[PDB]
Structure 1
């Protein structure tokens, strides 16, 4: 296969949050068939970021999803041609982000180019005041439509002091060639910041992603 049991990846992300421009570069690695992966990011421009790092962590790698053999793996099949993805994040306090990615492969390394646009975060909310403490483990609902893989996820950020800050994700994955489409299924993830420097200009993330059928069916 063009996707080896061990792979690396590079992340090039740029964008704005409430008008604040930034750039990030990442170097990641993982086991695509085990759904295990890690990434080390550096804020290369606009740092230190005046907003919660957590809104950016889910934008830094779908080939690293363990798919059981009886569920077609849309993203792994798209290679070597690759795929793109388009995400809408609707936060419960009215903030909205639109994120686009282009994913390609160069030997044993995936290349992700990401554009992030976030705005309408309340200036005294938990994202601009950096009161978030990571995403809860989550489940993306996935199904096939018009040759694209459509995902939806009721996400939630944990807050300093308790409580949750809700965010709805809508992600559409678009393979650059036709592939075998999967049935209606889910992907469970855990995403954690495992290390960071004082001002989050260097961050390390670990993510485990596993596809499955419904538990009760």
Structure 2
């Protein structure tokens, strides 16, 4: 690397609403961007305790920490120091919908993420409002270039208490603030786990491993 150190830290400032319930979150993270290893600690600074499952917010708390092979251009890393933004649509199988926007900037050895989250139509007796989810299954994002933007799609799935899954489709658009070398059709495999939290999830710790790769069968 040259603009992004082998070891970095980052802060998260998130604000939003879920079925009209307002909230604010702040986080402190660290990781090895070139190793795709990452960890972060969140604090519900306002509106807590949250009346909904924390799992819907975990993926909103850091693309620069993705291990990219040398032969696959790293769209996000190249965007700095200028940075980039991302826009996300989350469609859950029971009708709930969330729109999420991020702005990722850099200052020295620290990344700063500002996030706006809007989710609604979560059924009152559903898995989210009843807090019956138990983390996301490891996932694989399909990525490709278009209009100078990187577009990602992921078939997510939340594990349910008592078995089964609660599906959600992800569509994320990454917009670099300056033109960069565009990558080819590829994927990013991820593992995201809550590694610690207090009783009402007003405090949470998350671990994430992200690795880019070319199609397995080609």
Task: Report TM bin, short chain.
Answer: over 0.9
Provide Cα deviations, 1:64-112, integer angstroms capped at 9, x if missing partner.
Answer: 0000000000000000000000000000000000000000001000000
Supply the RMSD in Å over aligned alpha carbons.
Answer: 0.2
SS at match of 1:33: coil
Provide Cα deviations, 1:35-85, integer angstroms capped at 9, x if missing partner.
Answer: 000000000000000000000000000000000000000000000000000
TM norm structure 2: 0.99
User: Within the alignment, does 1:162 sit opposite 2:147 as a pair?
Assistant: no
Q: Distance in 1 between matches of 2:25 and 2:157?
A: 23
Q: Distance in 2 between matches of 1:147 and 1:35?
A: 24
State the match for 1:192 in structure 2: 193
State the match for 1:60 in structure 2: 61
Q: Distance in 1 between matches of 2:181 and 2:5?
A: 20
TM norm structure 1: 1.00
SS at match of 1:41: strand
Aligned residues between the structures: 217
Q: Distance in 2 between matches of 1:3 and 1:79?
A: 8
SS at match of 1:34: coil
Q: Distance in 2 between matches of 1:161 and 1:21?
A: 30
**Alpha-carbon deviation of 1:2?**
1.1
Provide Cα deviations, 1:93-147, integer angstroms capped at 9, x if missing partner.
Answer: 0000000000000100000000000000000000000000000000000000000
SS at match of 1:88: strand
List alignment gaps of at least 5 residues for structure 2.
Answer: none
